[PDB]
Symmetry: D2
Subunit: 394 residues, 4 copies
């Protein structure tokens, strides 16, 4: 049978705004930082890692095509360890964990690191005409960030797909604004109570005034009220819009990782782990309704775990758009009080490829905060997919 997967350690950076506090840190720099820190939290030597897998979507420089391997080596993992970079768009961070968990389940590794890293502030422009020349007439610099945020089949912003989902599932503007506000208030409470302190790795940021520690998610508005979201205008369609800058996730910079071991290695070393992996599942949907991807993915994951919605103490379902996040909670019958209890993409940000690893970290630490048992991690995926994993606190 398949080997049990234990998540022994996890960490994330705080999440930086677009053009904000992490804009000078490359995706391989952020990835190496979380690799070194998960190894130290698990008390695992860099020479004892079987596989490294990292999620990552937008290459900012040539090194990023080597991302998992540079993150591993500069993170202190020995050169004999294989390293893989995976891209399942917004779900890459969680995919990387599943992919790393699969090496353990199949007996190819006893230890594996799964992470993600993304720096959207550093997303590049391309010039397709530069290699062979344009010859005459104007050409373009192609924004690879906005490009990654366009559905490749209809060439519409992810935001338009969020409007498709609000329309189809009856998610009003007032519902989306209520979810957005509540996410900022939960995140601001979590910061004030220190709920994130143990799971965040501070980053010292070179400033002209001397070094200061970046250890707080800066996208969060701490003074928010209803009118900050009411006054805003829809941004992605000209007619009958509901999706705004305020009730859509940010675009952001972050990295996160977890370190996992077979259950037998974990036993024999005597680790005090975060959780075990119970099940995962994938799904594809209509690309024009990609925001509801978590629904079938979550259903299939719960079937594989032998669990029901009501057994979930903690749910991290990324708020890519309040339009889709509301529809996900509505179609699955979730309790909004248990979904994203400390905020999510709208308030903390959406550092694409890192997001799915980061919110796994969030779910596992929240399980420990409340003494819960089971957590669901799930996210929608551009191009029309969903991914879900269930973890058990142990």
């Amino acid at each position: 049978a398949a080997k049990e997967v234990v998540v022994v350690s996890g960490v994330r950076t705080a999440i930086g705004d677009f053009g904000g506090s992490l804009k000078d840190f490359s995706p391989t720099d952020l990835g190496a930082k979380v690799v070194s820190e998960v190894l130290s939290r698990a008390n695992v030597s860099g020479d004892a890692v079987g596989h490294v897998v990292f999620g990552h979507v937008v290459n900012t420089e040539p090194k990023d095509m080597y991302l998992a391997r540079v993150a591993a080596i500069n993170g202190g993992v020995a050169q004999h360890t294989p390293a893989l970079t995976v891209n399942r768009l917004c779900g890459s961070g969680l995919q990387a964990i599943v992919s790393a968990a699969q090496t353990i389940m199949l007996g190819d590794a006893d230890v594996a690191i799964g992470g993600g890293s993304e720096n959207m502030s550093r997303a590049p422009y391309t010039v397709p005409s530069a290699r062979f020349g344009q010859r005459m007439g104007d050409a373009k610099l192609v924004d690879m960030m906005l490009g990654a945020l366009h559905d490749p089949f209809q060439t519409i912003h992810m935001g338009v797909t969020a409007e498709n989902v609000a329309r189809k599932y009856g998610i009003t503007r007032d519902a989306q604004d209520a979810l957005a506000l509540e996410s900022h208030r939960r995140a601001a409470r979590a910061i004030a109570e220190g709920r994130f302190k143990d799971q965040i790795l501070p980053i010292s940021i070179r400033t002209k005034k001397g070094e200061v520690a970046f250890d707080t998610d800066e996208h969060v508005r701490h003074d928010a009220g209803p009118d900050d979201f009411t006054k805003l205008k829809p941004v992605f369609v000209k007619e009958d819009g509901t999706v705004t800058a305020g009730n859509a996730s940010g675009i952001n910079d972050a990295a996160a990782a977890v370190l996992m071991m077979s259950a037998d290695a974990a036993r024999a070393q005597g680790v005090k782990p975060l959780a075990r992996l119970v099940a995962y599942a994938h799904a594809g949907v209509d690309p024009a309704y990609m925001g509801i991807g978590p629904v079938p993915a979550t259903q299939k994951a719960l079937e594989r775990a032998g669990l029901k919605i009501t057994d979930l103490d903690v749910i991290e379902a990324n708020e890519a758009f309040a339009a889709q996040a509301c529809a996900v909670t509505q179609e699955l019958g979730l309790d909004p009080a248990k979904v994203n209890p400390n905020g999510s993409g709208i308030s903390l940000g959406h550092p694409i490829g890192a997001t799915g690893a980061l919110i796994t970290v969030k779910a596992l630490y929240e399980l420990k905060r409340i003494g819960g048992r089971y957590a669901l991690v799930t996210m929608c995926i551009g191009g029309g997919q969903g991914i879900a994993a269930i973890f058990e606190n142990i």
Copy 2:
């Protein structure tokens, strides 16, 4: 872990840098090979549990969706998950392994694994363009050349080939000898038609009319040893051995295989190419990445319960003659069974697709000669190797 059978496979002909496939984006070539493998396996696009594609150099925004776009435009139903993987030069074989893992773990009964790369379309980036340069000249960065540079010492992959030539005693004469033979085996394979059945022709729009591109165009059909000894090194100024002639090209191509669980293949009455026996991965010193195949192959043979002499076909990519000679030498392989129809030096190296493409070759060679076991392995920039073993059936 369930048994994985490879029922069908296909590849495009390999295009030269700036050549016949320069106008075909990577998702276009990926969609073509997807649609064709579905039809060769006679499998509904509604019956696929997972698509995984390897791809290294994003040429446009759509490429960040490559597997998904390849699957949808190739006729796979929207309900199928789709994943893009990057293990540099091994990405193509990785995608096959990753897709086979979904079947081994019972997450899918049917899976497609493939690779697609168009280096001709590799872009230049401008890292200062979003927030501005402000003052001073800025860089336009070659993402193709950057993909071919080791990220630790910022040296060309070719310098790591010189390192491997030093450490393992691969002379310049030894390299050009392999390079020449690779081209003769390829030209010989093209002439006997060995590649016909595995290649999907692509119609390439010319002013002269419609013309079908179905032949690997990197091959020198008139090659003699003199064409190689006259060239001189290009990666180290003095005391060098790797040249443009004994190193692979960089190229444009796509390939894919369709796989099923053993049960599903039986129930569908499909006559399969091969079965997956084992795979393994290895990490090595990045300065010596070209030797990656040796420990990968050793670990895979261990898991498969085989030895080197049980291998009837070996596709060990020729990234550089300097590396491939050393791989053969260290593993004790029979050069007659290693790349019997050429490899990267003669046929090309369309990186993210190569591992899938040479898997296709290896399976079709097994059928040509009636062999049993085939090894597929390659070196990986950054310092890895990947290897897989297949059994004809």
Copy 3:
């Protein structure tokens, strides 16, 4: 106002877009023509009072220094002031006028006037690159095409040529007739050697060895009317008449003349080409810029006390057959005396240099036929014309 004599002049052969002079920067070509005119006039580079050069499209930072770089690297002493002027297609003749003005006003006894342009090397700009684009695709702007667009209506200069064809009754047949004849006159001039003495050969580095570039390469030597009537318009989709064949090319070239006060020329025993009789400028509707030469020429003939029938040589640049036919028609000129050896359609239009270059032609034609008065005029994008009249001596 003192008398201005043109003692010497020279030009390069005109290169095609992407052709023989594509590797010669504008300051390089400018320095060449400076050094040569000094030596043809036998004037020390220490004796020059002013250098003025016309130039429109900056190809690199040095071009913002063009006149100064051309003068210094051409051997003019550093104590000579140097000015770059831009009156678009008239810049070359403007530089001559501006340099002649320093002599007329007694600010200098010796002055060089010239033009230099390399359109092949015209750059692309990135206006968002300094402070960044932030979000959304950005533009790479073609500065060559932008130079050829009217800045008021953002239409190609060719559309203004269609406007001129409408208003003045210039048929498509009339245009191709001028275009064909321009090419035959040029090929005929090249064959008799009319251009030999005025052209400075430039050695152009080829893999085949050293080869001398001394012949205007835009000329079709085998031209018949059929090569023009088969092409069809390119600047308005329907109801058009201007084509690639009856419009000038865009080209790379440099030219210059050296001038002196009458007294200084006498004292130096130099045998001059001609004297400056008069000049004038005109502004017109930008949508009809191609008719600019007509009022300029009329005003210049007034100041010179001459009429159209006193002109033995006319160099009226052929920007578009549609415009040049109308200029000849409105002024009542004899087509036999207008561009007797071709002009922009056959020879090319290296814009900032053209006005200087066709001044050179006009003066050398006066010597060839023993004529007295020559008119030099051209149209100017944005809606101007410039004209100058010279007297052989």
Copy 4:
């Protein structure tokens, strides 16, 4: 003989910082604004202009290759008026005035506008490899602003040539800092007393808070003291430097213009003019010592006017670098109290192609402020030139 040239009107914009308040106004936009305003100040119809000449160095867009003609037409000058753009680097603004004055002197025009316009914030990057392609390996985006500030013969920054001049002419660091400080204090006094109000055309600048008037030279430090310049480090050479960011001119955005007429047209219309043109002169020098160009140019201009240094009531000599400006004043024997009495490039900025027209405006208004008679306008020129003009208040 040559016809007398009367300067009837003049105007300038305030001078914007690099990336500052004028960064969104193109050079043809600024040029049209000053064209329309000089015409209105002279009470001259746009249909009665004989020639327009504008100085301009760095093309920011295709329209700039038509700069004088777009400035003229969009400024309200009739389309029958010829328009010329001139480039004599830093001296282009004054050259444009001389060139326009020459059309009057030679009887080709009775009215002529001479101006300059530059927007360095909008100076572009080029990509020489874009038209025909780079094929392989990295390429460059070429900074055309920094390129314009490099000597084309040795490829050294103008700042290094300023160090050549300080060395050769014995201009110490303390002298350069004293000149720099004094320029900011004079400029700040001029702003507080309103000395610039009549000569500046306000520009309404679209801001999110509503329209605000840009009418004050923003480069000026109003709170400066000696230590702001002492603390700074040399910027252009590694050894034995004296030239700093603080004692070098800024790079800037501005436009200016004057309108001139033959003396007979001015008489017959009855204008109340600023000044008459007395003489101008040019000079070239060693490109490596370009900063002393104003010395021989000023000497030759004074010879042509039949005047002496001591007849000059007002001197506008552009402070490109305190190193060169000090040497110019020292070699000509000028009184520093009469040179740049209200500041210059170091404190107000150096909007290259506009600078020479702008400081003509400054000199003519200062003549009126003090009832002086003769003003010298002079500037150094990259590549090694100088230009000078003398005006008489009438």
